[PDB]
Design a protein around this motif. Structure first.
Motif, PDB file in Angstrom:
ATOM      1  N   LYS A  10      32.027  31.898  39.417  1.00 11.13           N
ATOM      2  CA  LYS A  10      31.725  33.315  39.204  1.00 11.13           C
ATOM      3  C   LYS A  10      32.153  33.551  37.814  1.00 11.13           C
ATOM      4  O   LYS A  10      33.268  33.210  37.487  1.00 11.13           O
ATOM      5  CB  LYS A  10      32.558  34.187  40.114  1.00 11.13           C
ATOM      6  CG  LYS A  10      32.660  33.662  41.535  1.00 11.13           C
ATOM      7  CD  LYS A  10      31.312  33.549  42.133  1.00 11.13           C
ATOM      8  CE  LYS A  10      31.392  32.695  43.305  1.00 11.13           C
ATOM      9  NZ  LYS A  10      30.324  33.059  44.203  1.00 11.13           N
ATOM     10  N   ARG A  11      31.300  34.084  36.960  1.00  6.50           N
ATOM     11  CA  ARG A  11      31.523  33.862  35.542  1.00  6.50           C
ATOM     12  C   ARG A  11      32.526  34.820  34.945  1.00  6.50           C
ATOM     13  O   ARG A  11      32.179  35.808  34.340  1.00  6.50           O
ATOM     14  CB  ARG A  11      30.216  33.956  34.821  1.00  6.50           C
ATOM     15  CG  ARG A  11      29.583  32.637  34.636  1.00  6.50           C
ATOM     16  CD  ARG A  11      28.473  32.413  35.601  1.00  6.50           C
ATOM     17  NE  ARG A  11      28.526  31.054  36.099  1.00  6.50           N
ATOM     18  CZ  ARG A  11      27.545  30.170  36.022  1.00  6.50           C
ATOM     19  NH1 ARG A  11      26.385  30.466  35.472  1.00  6.50           N
ATOM     20  NH2 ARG A  11      27.739  28.971  36.518  1.00  6.50           N
ATOM     21  N   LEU A  12      33.793  34.510  35.077  1.00  6.13           N
ATOM     22  CA  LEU A  12      34.780  35.541  34.926  1.00  6.13           C
ATOM     23  C   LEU A  12      35.327  35.744  33.534  1.00  6.13           C
ATOM     24  O   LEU A  12      34.754  35.266  32.546  1.00  6.13           O
ATOM     25  CB  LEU A  12      35.892  35.263  35.890  1.00  6.13           C
ATOM     26  CG  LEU A  12      35.426  35.668  37.265  1.00  6.13           C
ATOM     27  CD1 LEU A  12      36.376  35.142  38.277  1.00  6.13           C
ATOM     28  CD2 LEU A  12      35.346  37.157  37.300  1.00  6.13           C
ATOM     29  N   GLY A  13      36.394  36.539  33.471  1.00  6.56           N
ATOM     30  CA  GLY A  13      37.180  36.724  32.272  1.00  6.56           C
ATOM     31  C   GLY A  13      36.773  37.887  31.418  1.00  6.56           C
ATOM     32  O   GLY A  13      36.042  38.787  31.837  1.00  6.56           O
ATOM     33  N   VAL A  14      37.274  37.858  30.191  1.00  5.62           N
ATOM     34  CA  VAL A  14      36.959  38.898  29.230  1.00  5.62           C
ATOM     35  C   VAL A  14      35.508  38.793  28.752  1.00  5.62           C
ATOM     36  O   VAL A  14      35.007  37.688  28.486  1.00  5.62           O
ATOM     37  CB  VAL A  14      37.907  38.842  28.039  1.00  5.62           C
ATOM     38  CG1 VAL A  14      37.414  39.736  26.927  1.00  5.62           C
ATOM     39  CG2 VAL A  14      39.267  39.269  28.466  1.00  5.62           C
ATOM     40  N   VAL A  29      36.147  43.521  31.394  1.00  8.57           N
ATOM     41  CA  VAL A  29      36.668  42.320  32.044  1.00  8.57           C
ATOM     42  C   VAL A  29      36.265  42.134  33.474  1.00  8.57           C
ATOM     43  O   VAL A  29      36.166  43.092  34.234  1.00  8.57           O
ATOM     44  CB  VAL A  29      38.141  42.304  32.087  1.00  8.57           C
ATOM     45  CG1 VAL A  29      38.584  40.926  32.068  1.00  8.57           C
ATOM     46  CG2 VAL A  29      38.654  42.963  30.925  1.00  8.57           C
ATOM     47  N   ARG A  30      36.041  40.878  33.830  1.00 10.23           N
ATOM     48  CA  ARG A  30      35.813  40.511  35.199  1.00 10.23           C
ATOM     49  C   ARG A  30      37.042  39.815  35.640  1.00 10.23           C
ATOM     50  O   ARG A  30      37.681  39.126  34.875  1.00 10.23           O
ATOM     51  CB  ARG A  30      34.644  39.578  35.298  1.00 10.23           C
ATOM     52  CG  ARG A  30      33.403  40.151  34.692  1.00 10.23           C
ATOM     53  CD  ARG A  30      32.231  39.917  35.586  1.00 10.23           C
ATOM     54  NE  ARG A  30      31.709  41.141  36.193  1.00 10.23           N
ATOM     55  CZ  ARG A  30      30.904  41.135  37.265  1.00 10.23           C
ATOM     56  NH1 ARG A  30      30.584  39.944  37.809  1.00 10.23           N
ATOM     57  NH2 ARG A  30      30.412  42.272  37.799  1.00 10.23           N
ATOM     58  N   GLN A  31      37.413  40.004  36.878  1.00 14.37           N
ATOM     59  CA  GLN A  31      38.678  39.461  37.312  1.00 14.37           C
ATOM     60  C   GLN A  31      38.788  39.616  38.804  1.00 14.37           C
ATOM     61  O   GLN A  31      38.109  40.448  39.385  1.00 14.37           O
ATOM     62  CB  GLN A  31      39.805  40.199  36.613  1.00 14.37           C
ATOM     63  CG  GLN A  31      39.748  41.704  36.719  1.00 14.37           C
ATOM     64  CD  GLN A  31      40.972  42.357  36.134  1.00 14.37           C
ATOM     65  OE1 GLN A  31      42.005  41.733  35.991  1.00 14.37           O
ATOM     66  NE2 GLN A  31      40.857  43.609  35.785  1.00 14.37           N
ATOM     67  N   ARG A  32      39.608  38.823  39.455  1.00 16.19           N
ATOM     68  CA  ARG A  32      39.659  38.973  40.878  1.00 16.19           C
ATOM     69  C   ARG A  32      40.714  40.001  41.244  1.00 16.19           C
ATOM     70  O   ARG A  32      40.428  40.981  41.935  1.00 16.19           O
ATOM     71  CB  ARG A  32      39.928  37.636  41.521  1.00 16.19           C
ATOM     72  CG  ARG A  32      38.845  36.665  41.276  1.00 16.19           C
ATOM     73  CD  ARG A  32      37.626  36.925  42.115  1.00 16.19           C
ATOM     74  NE  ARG A  32      36.604  35.922  41.843  1.00 16.19           N
ATOM     75  CZ  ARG A  32      36.811  34.595  41.854  1.00 16.19           C
ATOM     76  NH1 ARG A  32      38.006  34.066  42.139  1.00 16.19           N
ATOM     77  NH2 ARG A  32      35.805  33.768  41.575  1.00 16.19           N
ATOM     78  N   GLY A  33      41.938  39.782  40.786  1.00 17.28           N
ATOM     79  CA  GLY A  33      42.963  40.795  40.937  1.00 17.28           C
ATOM     80  C   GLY A  33      42.938  41.679  39.719  1.00 17.28           C
ATOM     81  O   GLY A  33      42.102  41.501  38.863  1.00 17.28           O
ATOM     82  N   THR A  34      43.848  42.618  39.602  1.00 17.61           N
ATOM     83  CA  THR A  34      43.915  43.376  38.373  1.00 17.61           C
ATOM     84  C   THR A  34      44.861  42.668  37.404  1.00 17.61           C
ATOM     85  O   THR A  34      45.986  43.084  37.171  1.00 17.61           O
ATOM     86  CB  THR A  34      44.378  44.766  38.629  1.00 17.61           C
ATOM     87  OG1 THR A  34      45.671  44.687  39.210  1.00 17.61           O
ATOM     88  CG2 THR A  34      43.463  45.467  39.600  1.00 17.61           C
ATOM     89  N   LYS A  35      44.376  41.556  36.875  1.00 15.96           N
ATOM     90  CA  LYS A  35      45.017  40.839  35.794  1.00 15.96           C
ATOM     91  C   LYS A  35      45.248  41.808  34.649  1.00 15.96           C
ATOM     92  O   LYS A  35      46.326  41.920  34.106  1.00 15.96           O
ATOM     93  CB  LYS A  35      44.080  39.715  35.376  1.00 15.96           C
ATOM     94  CG  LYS A  35      44.737  38.517  34.740  1.00 15.96           C
ATOM     95  CD  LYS A  35      44.327  37.202  35.429  1.00 15.96           C
ATOM     96  CE  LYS A  35      45.573  36.361  35.671  1.00 15.96           C
ATOM     97  NZ  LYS A  35      45.429  34.905  35.417  1.00 15.96           N
ATOM     98  N   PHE A  36      44.205  42.519  34.286  1.00 12.74           N
ATOM     99  CA  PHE A  36      44.335  43.656  33.407  1.00 12.74           C
ATOM    100  C   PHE A  36      44.199  44.917  34.207  1.00 12.74           C
ATOM    101  O   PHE A  36      43.604  44.901  35.270  1.00 12.74           O
ATOM    102  CB  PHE A  36      43.244  43.604  32.379  1.00 12.74           C
ATOM    103  CG  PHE A  36      43.314  42.412  31.555  1.00 12.74           C
ATOM    104  CD1 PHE A  36      42.584  41.313  31.866  1.00 12.74           C
ATOM    105  CD2 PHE A  36      44.163  42.367  30.493  1.00 12.74           C
ATOM    106  CE1 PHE A  36      42.667  40.202  31.109  1.00 12.74           C
ATOM    107  CE2 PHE A  36      44.254  41.274  29.736  1.00 12.74           C
ATOM    108  CZ  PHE A  36      43.501  40.180  30.038  1.00 12.74           C
ATOM    109  N   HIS A  37      44.742  46.009  33.693  1.00 10.49           N
ATOM    110  CA  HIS A  37      44.694  47.280  34.389  1.00 10.49           C
ATOM    111  C   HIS A  37      43.948  48.270  33.558  1.00 10.49           C
ATOM    112  O   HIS A  37      43.927  48.147  32.344  1.00 10.49           O
ATOM    113  CB  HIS A  37      46.096  47.794  34.602  1.00 10.49           C
ATOM    114  CG  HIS A  37      46.829  47.094  35.695  1.00 10.49           C
ATOM    115  ND1 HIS A  37      46.757  47.497  37.016  1.00 10.49           N
ATOM    116  CD2 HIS A  37      47.662  46.022  35.667  1.00 10.49           C
ATOM    117  CE1 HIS A  37      47.515  46.698  37.752  1.00 10.49           C
ATOM    118  NE2 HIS A  37      48.075  45.795  36.960  1.00 10.49           N
TER     119      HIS A  37
END
Ligand SMILES: [Mg+2]
Ligand SMILES: [Mg+2]
Ligand SMILES: [Mg+2]
Ligand SMILES: [Mg+2]
Ligand SMILES: [Mg+2]
Ligand SMILES: [Mg+2]
Ligand SMILES: [Mg+2]
Ligand SMILES: [Mg+2]
Ligand SMILES: [Mg+2]
Ligand SMILES: [Mg+2]
Ligand SMILES: [Mg+2]
Ligand SMILES: [Mg+2]
Ligand SMILES: [Mg+2]
Ligand SMILES: [Mg+2]
Ligand SMILES: [Mg+2]
Ligand SMILES: [Mg+2]
Ligand SMILES: [Mg+2]
Ligand SMILES: [Mg+2]
Ligand SMILES: [Mg+2]
Ligand SMILES: [Mg+2]
Ligand SMILES: [Mg+2]
Ligand SMILES: [Mg+2]
Ligand SMILES: [Mg+2]
Ligand SMILES: [Mg+2]
Ligand SMILES: [Mg+2]
Ligand SMILES: [Mg+2]
Ligand SMILES: [Mg+2]
Ligand SMILES: [Mg+2]
Ligand SMILES: [Mg+2]
Ligand SMILES: [Mg+2]
Ligand SMILES: [Mg+2]
Ligand SMILES: [Mg+2]
Ligand SMILES: [Mg+2]
Ligand SMILES: [Mg+2]
Ligand SMILES: [Mg+2]
Lengths: 76, 61, 64, 50
Positions: A10-14, A29-37
């Motif tokens: 799943k093509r994640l990240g910034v 950003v794509r992310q599974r948890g809230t790595k970033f908020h």
RNA sequence: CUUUAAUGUUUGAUGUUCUAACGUUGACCCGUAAUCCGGGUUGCGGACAGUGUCUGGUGGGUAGUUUGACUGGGGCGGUCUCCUCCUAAAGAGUAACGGAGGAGCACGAAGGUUGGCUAAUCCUGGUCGGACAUCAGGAGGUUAGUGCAAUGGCAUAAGCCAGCUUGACUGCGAGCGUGACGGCGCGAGCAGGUGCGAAAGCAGGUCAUAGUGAUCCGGUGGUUCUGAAUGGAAGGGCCAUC
RNA sequence: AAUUCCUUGUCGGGUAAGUUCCGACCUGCACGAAUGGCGUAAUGAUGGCCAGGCUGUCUCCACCCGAGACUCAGUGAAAUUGAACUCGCUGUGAAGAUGCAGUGUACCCGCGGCAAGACGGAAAGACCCCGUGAACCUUUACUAUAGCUUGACACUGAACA
RNA sequence: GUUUAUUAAAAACACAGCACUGUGCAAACACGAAAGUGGACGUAUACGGUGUGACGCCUGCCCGGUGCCGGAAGGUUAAU
RNA sequence: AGGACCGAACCGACUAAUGUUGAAAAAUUAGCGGAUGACUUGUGGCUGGGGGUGAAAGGCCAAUCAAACCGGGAGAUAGCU
């Protein structure tokens, strides 16, 4: 035990690094948890995808007593 | 009589395996292979048996 | 001999003003309950054959 | 698997309905809920639920 | 109604008699000096047998074909779609019959909101009671928990409990992610109408990422959109669905 | 064992010595009673084993007569063949070199001989795999179908139980 | 005795014998869309099919599966 | 008397050598089985290609046969060389 399966990536990240000017709507950003908020003018979607609620430049901060990353969008 | 006992074990052994061929629980490959270990086992058990026999044969002669 | 039209692609793309083709979205024919309303709702309108596919659609519809 | 599909069907005039599933096994009591009937364009009761 | 019996009405079947269709590969007559065939006479069968049309069974006797692919040759075994992690070289992506695990669901609350609460593990005490059953205190401080694999998140809780409730909402959607494509995902916001909240406000299912099946062909409900002279109708389209 | 995988099973016999043979044992991987079992006199260009006689089969080859081979005269083919001014080694190299590197060796050309190399000639490998190839053959593969079989109707009628 | 004309002559095929089975004669069966014909100018001491294979001694146990031969109260079931 | 015995013609084809661009597209040479029989042979007839015939080998059907030969559909098709 019979391996050799994986799932499609799943093509994640910034998607937009700090300073990038984005249009209200875009996905920072794509992310599974809230790595970033989400910070100011950034909505967090229901898969934690963070996006822009406002056209501006992307802003990364670490705020908070817990020292967490936030993404905001400053007007430019 | 002894080699005969050894061998009878050869026989159940292969029997067990032989039978794990249907109920395809073993590759025809698997199968050859193993039956070979059993041969190896059998030859070994035997050569022992013949060492022994020889030991004694020395005595008697 | 007149090129014959792929009779079935003609039943699925309709040629449009500027030149593209419009088609109906797949995935809205059954197994419907299990799909979101957003989703289904967006597959209701029609759509334009992709840059990559015209090649094939034009190929099929020489008299479109 | 197990979980039956069901329609809930406007109590208003319209034949319009929403669609969902239930655990028929442990919940046989006709489901029933206020949902938006976009025909009458109001919020009515929606019944049926095998 | 049970079960039963009987005259009758209906409908089937089974049998016997007849002769005149039909059979005769019994007999004799003529064509005819002919073992064919035809007609005739007779005997024997006789509405049977047999044949046409339709129909159920049987039917390798015959016929046309099918019997996947990956693979450290092939076969054998195993695998085929989806999800998590490592390999992956600090953006994305990245191969092997590389290393590990999971999915083909579940839930009308396990959803929405408003208010509220906060785990494990150890020590100390004290009923059974234990290394851990509940209770007290302290330590600890999220190791707990999260319907389920793994990763990422979660205290403002995404963890736990209650009240009211149906936003598991209809139309749309600037803008963006990701894909050869078919598609998939994220989305503020706009209109309608809603639930919780004093209120700011939150809600278009569920901490997130699996839980899936294109098109065709039909089925079901709705809408006069179409309707082969015209009015209807069948059928077709459109929207929801299987 | 025409059947036994382990297996040249074990014992006996035959031999100087016998994986075969004969006779036994039963541990028959996996004989067995008309897909017949066990026997059987005779028969057999049948399979296995033994012995006498025989011997160039052999130790181990010798001489000899004949047909070729060889020379002369006449006639006069063949497969093959990119082009050749067509050596050995050791190395290199699409990985087994006349042809490349290095080096050794070799005056030019026939004739009779021999088959180690020219991955020598011959046949677009038969094994092997591939092709959504072919063909026959099988069957409780699929689908049809002649045949056989069931009923209805028709040719097909009259009385009755 | 037969056999792979042209790499297999055999232990294979055939055989007399044996058994099972079908067949009442316009026989079964076979070649025939049929008419016809073979079976046979025969008639169950006959004729076809199948397996076994002189002769001797013999040929055990199992009928669930699959065939076939029968029965049939019930269940389901075609054209109409 | 006999699918009886030895053995030529005749019919076969068990072994070996030669031959293998043959003398020959299956032979020669020396040996071999049968030889009154289910024997062998001349002439003619009949059986036709999913068909025949077969003491059964998938044998034989004109130097061939798990489907003859000839002409046609025909320039079948060839994701291969
Ligand atoms: Mg639809
Ligand atoms: Mg077939
Ligand atoms: Mg393959
Ligand atoms: Mg990376
Ligand atoms: Mg990198
Ligand atoms: Mg929860
Ligand atoms: Mg709260
Ligand atoms: Mg305690
Ligand atoms: Mg009309
Ligand atoms: Mg009309
Ligand atoms: Mg013996
Ligand atoms: Mg018996
Ligand atoms: Mg026998
Ligand atoms: Mg000369
Ligand atoms: Mg050299
Ligand atoms: Mg070399
Ligand atoms: Mg020379
Ligand atoms: Mg020579
Ligand atoms: Mg060669
Ligand atoms: Mg080739
Ligand atoms: Mg070939
Ligand atoms: Mg003989
Ligand atoms: Mg031959
Ligand atoms: Mg008979
Ligand atoms: Mg036999
Ligand atoms: Mg004789
Ligand atoms: Mg021969
Ligand atoms: Mg001779
Ligand atoms: Mg003789
Ligand atoms: Mg002749
Ligand atoms: Mg054969
Ligand atoms: Mg021939
Ligand atoms: Mg053919
Ligand atoms: Mg053609
Ligand atoms: Mg051609």
């Amino acid at each position: 035990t019979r391996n050799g399966r994986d799932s499609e990536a799943k093509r994640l990240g910034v998607k937009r690094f700090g300073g990038e000017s984005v249009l209200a709507g875009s996905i920072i950003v794509r992310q599974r948890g809230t790595k970033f908020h989400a910070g100011a003018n950034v909505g967090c979607g229901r898969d934690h995808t963070l996006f822009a609620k406002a056209d501006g430049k992307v802003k990364f901060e670490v705020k908070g007593p817990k020292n967490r990353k936030f993404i905001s969008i400053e007007a430019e | 009589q002894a080699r005969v006992a050894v061998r009878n074990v050869r026989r159940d052994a292969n029997d067990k395996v032989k039978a794990l061929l249907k109920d395809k629980e073993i590759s025809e490959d698997d199968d050859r292979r193993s039956q070979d270990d059993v041969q190896k086992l059998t030859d070994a058990a035997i050569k022992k048996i013949e060492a022994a026999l020889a030991d004694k044969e020395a005595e008697l002669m | 001999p007149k090129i014959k039209t792929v009779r079935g692609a003609a039943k699925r793309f309709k040629k449009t003003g500027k030149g593209g083709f419009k088609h109906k979205h797949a995935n809205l024919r059954h197994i419907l309950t299990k799909k979101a309303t957003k989703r289904k709702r967006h597959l209701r309108p029609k759509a334009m054959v992709s840059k990559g596919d015209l090649g094939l659609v034009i190929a099929c519809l020489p008299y479109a | 698997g197990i979980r039956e599909k069901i329609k809930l069907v406007s109590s208003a005039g319209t034949g319009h309905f929403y669609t969902t599933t239930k655990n028929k096994r442990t919940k046989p009591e006709k489901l029933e809920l206020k949902k938006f009937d976009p025909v009458v364009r109001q919020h009515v009761i929606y019944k049926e639920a095998k």
